Ligand binder design. Structure first.
Ligand SMILES: CC(=O)N[C@@H]1[C@@H](O[C@H]2O[C@H](CO)[C@H](O[C@H]3O[C@H](CO[C@@H]4O[C@@H](C)[C@H](O)[C@@H](O)[C@H]4O)[C@@H](O)[C@H](O)[C@H]3O)[C@H](O[C@@H]3O[C@H](CO)[C@@H](O)[C@H](O)[C@H]3NC(C)=O)[C@H]2O)[C@H](O)[C@@H](CO[C@H]2O[C@H](CO)[C@@H](O)[C@H](O)[C@H]2O)O[C@@H]1O
Ligand SMILES: CC(=O)N[C@@H]1[C@@H](O[C@H]2O[C@H](CO)[C@H](O[C@H]3O[C@H](CO[C@@H]4O[C@@H](C)[C@H](O)[C@@H](O)[C@H]4O)[C@@H](O)[C@H](O)[C@H]3O)[C@H](O[C@@H]3O[C@H](CO)[C@@H](O)[C@H](O)[C@H]3NC(C)=O)[C@H]2O)[C@H](O)[C@@H](CO[C@H]2O[C@H](CO)[C@@H](O)[C@H](O)[C@H]2O)O[C@@H]1O
Ligand SMILES: CC(=O)N[C@@H]1[C@@H](O[C@H]2O[C@H](CO)[C@H](O[C@H]3O[C@H](CO[C@@H]4O[C@@H](C)[C@H](O)[C@@H](O)[C@H]4O)[C@@H](O)[C@H](O)[C@H]3O)[C@H](O[C@@H]3O[C@H](CO)[C@@H](O)[C@H](O)[C@H]3NC(C)=O)[C@H]2O)[C@H](O)[C@@H](CO[C@H]2O[C@H](CO)[C@@H](O)[C@H](O)[C@H]2O)O[C@@H]1O
Ligand code: NA
Ligand code: NA
Ligand code: NA
Ligand code: NA
Ligand code: NA
Ligand code: NA
Ligand code: NA
Ligand code: NA
Ligand code: NA
Lengths: 596, 596, 596
């Protein structure tokens, strides 16, 4: 009996009944211990003796053995115990080797990480993906991962190692073709990695989430080619209530917090500091296998960010046989700023970017039905390269309502570069343009419409303070066609502006262009006492449907017309009043209107 | 000693002291095992031998025994172990029998569901409510359920069984008269049920929540009368971060995700696919016992939905002795679309519906102080039956600001049908009207004001693209009274429209009606050289306070007035200018204005 | 052997191997029991015998012993067992004694509170802070607390005791200089306390959160000086999805739910009832040591509140050597109401308050770049002291877009009192002004601009119903300078108003003031048949750049001008038309415009 009791089967001979309840199961101690499982149950030598973790012990095979066994019983939760650091020191084998995998995840096997998991210097300068849910080196031939959750108060620490080569890939958790999988509560820190977590594979997967995680200092070298902390590559998936921080200079040029790359995905309630970018919202044709060619129902909401480049980047692209489409997006409630930096020291600052594809093409995109509403954006006054929207590729629609943008440009695209075709750009009068960059805008147009064409668009400009440094509120080069559009410049704070709206190709004459903006006009009357016509000297007003005074009349003996219409020769004309006769000559600020 | 050790009291004789710490309690193994409890501790035959769960074992009595016992000790958490499916195969007894109850929940007893709970075919074609928190067949005589939480990574599977009769009810969790109760993390799937979860009872309860749950395929037959996945019937309660999906055709006609039926309730951050409806926000008089007659502080926010009917439905109704009121509602940040379907193939598509009561009455409602802001809505171009708001019953107020609606109608109600009395309908100019349905609107009015009366309302129409197919932007039949209102149609994209605003009863003449909209007007001048009057041919402008040109003047020898006022006979009149004399005749596009 | 087995080392001699797996560690029962730890493991007398908790047992030393021991092993989670109430009955010792501390928290030691923790009457009328993370009486000399989480379904009950003196402080959890600490799921109830939870210390700390907690009835006496349920005094920290309720009358005058006092902090998705205030968003100079002098990236979003005073209070202040600044704030998606109360029975009701410092100074603040968007506010019609914004101290900017405010005042500040200097106040036309207080406003100005000066501001007034009781829509006293501003009053529902906008110092004449508002004007024409001038009788219109008719013309034989400009003597003048000659005299409603 003593022998049995001291043997590994001893607990299986000690009887137990819950709280001495006579109606409860007569069990053995081992049965109750068998209800939970930890790494300690597999972290042993060939003779079954427990091995202490530490920097000179590779815990990988033990952890894999745990996962494999629990998988065999239909699943469960393995605890990685608190108060210990568990080092990983070799690559895994089989299907995950194609993915430089360390640990293979398996369906229904959750990890409750309370302790710390730390990479050993075996991985210095090498690729790695710490946890991998694919079961095949080729993801297309991989089975699925289902019902796998990683959670706890613990830590995945990437050991600080730099990348060995830019072409290398590194990841924390790749769930694979992942259905009902999640990461909750975990801190990922101290690396130079490509991603911390990836969800799904080219649209295959569903209901994957990252919640209440922290990601701290995950880029550290110039070798790192590119970093996106969470890539969401399956639908009905998202990121909520996370914290993302970088301190590296390199992160300000390369790192993004989230990629939303399939339909019905979201990014909410998170805080970001030290990153180049906030989120991509993208349909890559190359990734359309699992869930279709459309990214729709895309939500970026209630985030806080200090970034150095662009907050939300929109795009879609094509392959030889597939075309990607992006539609039905909402960006709302976010408060974002470009952090302190020199002008042009990082990628061009923006709230929204319409980004050309990875080859630079701006004529492949099919982006539409986007609503950008109730956001704040700020950039410091020196950051010339800051815009509410950098509109650098074809756009089929984007709607701005009730935002507050306080940066250098409202709408921008660089001249010379791409010439996007623009449709359904709506900038509602309820967008408030801040004043931080007042006096900085010499030579610049607030809305610099450097496009091939604009159609079915609305730009309602409303200033909230003066900025007499700007060349114009809005300017269209002669190369930009403009049709079936509404372009207005509210008069407030514009009295002293030389140019308000500028149409370098006189595009405001178009049949279906609806405009209004202030201008100064010289007029001269006839001599006649009484009701008397005033006519503009210039003849550039053939497009004007009505105009009205924005100036007081300092005279007693006459008054100019309150309102004007035009004449076939391009003059304005209205009827004023000469109390006493005489030819009058006045220079008046008018609101020019066309079909409005 | 050997006998004691092998007995069910053996663990109570093996000493233990935590980590060999001399300051720790000298305990027995059984004490430490007694700190947790699982179904295995009650899942045993009369001789105390453990019984394996499976399809031919009814786990119900064992689970009830666990709950009952733990209840007796002041509560705790029972685990339902992972890696096992636990079948339920009979009805419960006593107080829950009135509710077709299987398991009775008890206060302070939490269930940590890690495994799967599955209904056996005993329940095929029968009613059932799996977990029930009432303790009496009559809910009015029921005690409360308090501090009961169901959580975990497991699954409640309803076995796929269809309803036997439409009158049957089926539920997953009925918390009852429920205070501080919740469901977190659980997947409900594979049924034909009425509800998955219900919270509270007719206003009794508080602080009940459903968080991070999934609801998958919970309608499957034509027998199912009606389905609402979560019913929230107690205050200070809500639904957050959940996932709702249906695949059945029947779900598109019958199923709703959430009912918010008491004050201080919310529905946020959730994704819905395949449902008819998103949420009801309702005060039923019949349900006002526990928390009063007012549903206020109702929040629907930051959800993603593809539905087939209406997203948010507002209502309130009355009984012989109680009147229900709905006020102080916010609907914001939601991105919603009507899924691909034929016109009229499901209930009429809408973002907001003002729904008549269950008997069809439209004159019982008291709905007011609603804010609908910063939402997106889309319906495909063929879906004739799509509206920003279907306003089908009396409305005492609803405010729309800064939404983006892209569907067939903005405001709609069917003619012939109900004639709602409308007050305080506010449609701010910052609502962007999309263009998906451009060219589809022959015979239709964008804002079809098919009401008994409208008062204290604002409709500011702003197009963003042309749609010359529409009969009018806004139309009031002669049967609709209109007073103390503002109705404007911005001119942009309307130059070629025959009708902009239409008042079939000439209601725009009312003393306290403030309007403006474009119109084409024929004018003829007197002969006089110099300042010369132009007068409209028609005499239908007695209501007009001013009008101004929206057309250019192609002439050299004269110009029409820039502006006009009226004359008692209904003509317009203004002063233009004949450089040379002669009677002039022109047809001009004017902005007609009344008291604006 | 029997002796060993019955000894406290007995479990260390019973072998166990997980599920009889031959590849698993050969362990001893004690090893597996050692994987978890509870209060029962320390809740024992000097002889190691377990002691039952209860009202006459002080559990404090036992709980401290547990925390201390687990701390010694690098951390872990101590469970406070369900089904027991654990009373605390004495003060702690050492470093926490300076903080009236009961229990000292330690790094990496989590508490899983499933049972109830209750204060014994030893604490009646005494200060206390139940859990304290400082390790020194002087917080400046304190070490940090890291990785400390308190979570569970249990309860901290403050025993109902009143404060003994107003100067006393009481707290639930003070995390101290706290990094990666949180409270989740816990109910705090039944006290008279200063705070329930405090996070950080004067900017030191990071990543501290309070989530899914309840706070119930935490003020109960007139002695209580001040109450704020959660104070957030470290960056990258916040409050989400919590419930706050008070029932005391005193709470309506003293209690606030949240203080956000450092950068990158948030308050979201919470419900508040019975409180005076919702949140302070503040930079106290006195608290700038740990994270700088700027509070930026401040987010208050998607909350539900019934309060009696002010919802969000903004401020910043200075010390002898430090100046605090507040910028980059977003307040959105909140639905708030002032609960039923008499006028002036609690602190003045407001959605936003710009509050003077604790000494009453209104000239120390540096508050700017605030966006208040997509919120609802309501106050009952009798509550005279209700405002969208009480603007009581210097303001460097605040932007309102697309809110719905339904209360007595829009903008208010009491006359006589403070004279704030106001810059960059933007009130967009998309703010909807409700009608609840229509007919209550005798003697009152809707926008009562009781400031020293206003600059670079926009007030676009839009009514949605009539309120002829109000003295004016907007009024500027002569003492308020006004420059570089836009002030408009839309005409809708104003026809019958005697005063619309009132400039008691004729400030609308300023060179860079842009205004428009309705007025009634008497005009008289010359005799001349044909085109004929009309001139105002009054000469108060020297500032007017144009005016246009808002009235119909009931006459046949003539018409007044549609539009007007001015003359140097301050008259208006326009050209109408006498079909037949004669001097005309008319009283017309005009839209007066200046530079707009
Ligand atoms: C860091 C990051 O994610 N950046 C975004 C861009 O991602 C694109 O580049 C990445 C560079 O790291 C990825 O490519 C790299 O990795 C590929 C995948 O690795 C293979 O497959 C894995 C499943 C295995 O485990 C690996 O062992 C390996 O075999 C590899 O094929 C590439 O050669 C390599 O460079 C990223 O690739 C995606 O990664 C996810 C997550 O792991 C995976 O689920 C996908 O299957 C995989 N996709 C593809 C096509 O391989 C690759 O997409 C991203 O393109 C960009 C979006 O913005 C641009 O495009 C927009 C749309 O046109 C445009 O609007 C915008 O302006 C553009 O800048 O955003 C980040 O830069
Ligand atoms: C599926 C669903 O919930 N639909 C919504 C409507 O709910 C209404 O019909 C339901 C049909 O299933 C419910 O009625 C059914 O159930 C009743 C309750 O069951 C009894 O009581 C339980 C406590 C016991 O456990 C049961 O054993 C049983 O005894 C039963 O009395 C009815 O006879 C039966 O048809 C639903 O009833 C509510 O259910 C909740 C949750 O279980 C419960 O807490 C309530 O006490 C109970 N209420 C009542 C009054 O019984 C019943 O409300 C819902 O009416 C509708 C709202 O929209 C309509 O009304 C709006 C306001 O006028 C109007 O704006 C809109 O246009 C209308 O369509 O939304 C769903 O259809
Ligand atoms: C209840 C509450 O928090 N009210 C808010 C105001 O807080 C200010 O008053 C509080 C009164 O309780 C606090 O002061 C009290 O406590 C101080 C701290 O206790 C000391 O230090 C602790 C760390 C130890 O554990 C204690 O043992 C003790 O030694 C004490 O020094 C004060 O003497 C006492 O009155 C509150 O103090 C802060 O407390 C937090 C949390 O514990 C702590 O992290 C801070 O270090 C500590 N700060 C300071 C400076 O001591 C104190 O701040 C708050 O001022 C107000 C904001 O609104 C006003 O100011 C705005 C900006 O000018 C203005 O816009 C607005 O209109 C004003 O009303 O909001 C609440 O009233
Ligand atoms: Na690979
Ligand atoms: Na849009
Ligand atoms: Na071009
Ligand atoms: Na029943
Ligand atoms: Na409203
Ligand atoms: Na009628
Ligand atoms: Na102190
Ligand atoms: Na602002
Ligand atoms: Na002054």
């Amino acid at each position: 009996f003593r022998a049995i009791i001291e043997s590994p089967e001893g607990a299986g001979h000690v009887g137990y009944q819950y709280r001495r309840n006579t109606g409860s199961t007569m069990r053995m101690v081992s049965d109750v211990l068998d209800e939970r499982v930890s790494l300690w149950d597999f972290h042993c030598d060939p003779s079954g003796n427990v091995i202490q973790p530490g920097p000179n012990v590779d815990s990988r095979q033990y952890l894999q053995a745990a996962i494999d066994y629990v998988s065999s019983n239909g699943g469960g939760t393995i605890t990685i115990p608190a108060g210990y650091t568990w080092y990983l020191g070799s690559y895994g084998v089989g299907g995950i080797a194609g993915h430089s995998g360390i640990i293979q995840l398996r369906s229904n096997v959750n990890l409750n990480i309370e302790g710390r998991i730390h990479l050993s210097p075996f991985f210095d300068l090498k690729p790695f993906q710490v946890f991998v849910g694919f079961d095949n080196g080729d993801p297309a031939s991989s089975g699925n991962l289902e019902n796998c959750h990683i959670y706890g108060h613990g830590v995945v620490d990437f050991g600080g190692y730099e990348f060995g080569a830019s072409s290398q890939l590194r990841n924390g958790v790749a769930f694979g073709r992942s259905y009902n999988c999640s990461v909750t509560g975990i801190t990922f820190q101290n690396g130079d990695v490509t991603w911390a977590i990836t969800l799904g594979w080219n649209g295959y997967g569903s209901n994957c989430y990252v919640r209440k995680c922290r990601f701290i200092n995950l880029v550290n070298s110039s070798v790192n080619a590119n970093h996106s902390t969470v890539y969401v590559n399956c639908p009905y998936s998202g990121v909520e209530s996370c914290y993302f921080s970088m301190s590296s200079s390199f992160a300000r040029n390369i790192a993004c917090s989230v990629q939303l790359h399939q339909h019905d995905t979201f990014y909410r309630g998170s805080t970001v500091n030290g990153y180049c970018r906030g989120a991509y919202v993208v349909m890559h044709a190359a990734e359309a296998a699992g869930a279709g060619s459309y990214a729709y129902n895309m939500q970026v909401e209630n985030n806080i960010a200090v970034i150095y480049g662009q907050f939300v980047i929109l795009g879609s692209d094509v392959t030889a046989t597939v075309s990607g489409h992006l539609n039905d997006v909402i960006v709302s409630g976010n408060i974002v700023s470009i952090g302190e930096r020199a002008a042009f020291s990082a990628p061009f600052g923006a709230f929204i970017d319409i980004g050309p594809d990875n080859s630079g093409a701006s004529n492949v995109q099919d982006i539409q039905r986007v609503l950008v509403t109730g956001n704040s954006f700020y950039a410091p006054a020196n950051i010339t390269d800051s815009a509410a929207i950098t509109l650098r590729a074809n756009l089929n629609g984007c709607t701005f309502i009730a935002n507050n943008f306080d940066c250098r440009y409202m709408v921008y695209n660089a001249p010379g570069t791409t010439s996007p075709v623009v449709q359904n750009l709506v900038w509602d009068k309820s967008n408030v343009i801040g004043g931080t960059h007042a006096n900085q805008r010499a030579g610049q147009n607030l809305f610099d419409m450097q496009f091939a064409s604009v159609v079915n668009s609305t730009i309602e400009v409303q200033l909230s303070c003066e900025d007499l440094s700007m060349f114009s509120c809005i300017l269209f080069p002669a190369s930009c066609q403009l049709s079936y559009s509404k372009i207005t410049v509210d008069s407030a704070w514009t009295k002293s502006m030389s140019n308000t709206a500028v149409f370098e190709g006189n595009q405001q004459a178009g049949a279906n262009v609806y405009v209004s903006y202030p201008a100064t006009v010289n007029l001269t009357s006839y001599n006649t006492q009484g009701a008397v016509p005033f006519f503009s000297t210039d003849t550039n007003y053939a497009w004007v449907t009505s105009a009205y005074s924005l100036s007081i009349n300092e005279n007693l003996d006459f008054s100019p017309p309150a309102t004007y219409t035009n004449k076939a020769n391009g003059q304005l004309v209205g009827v004023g009043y000469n109390e006493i006769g005489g030819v009058r000559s006045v220079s008046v600020r008018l609101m020019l209107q066309r079909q409005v």
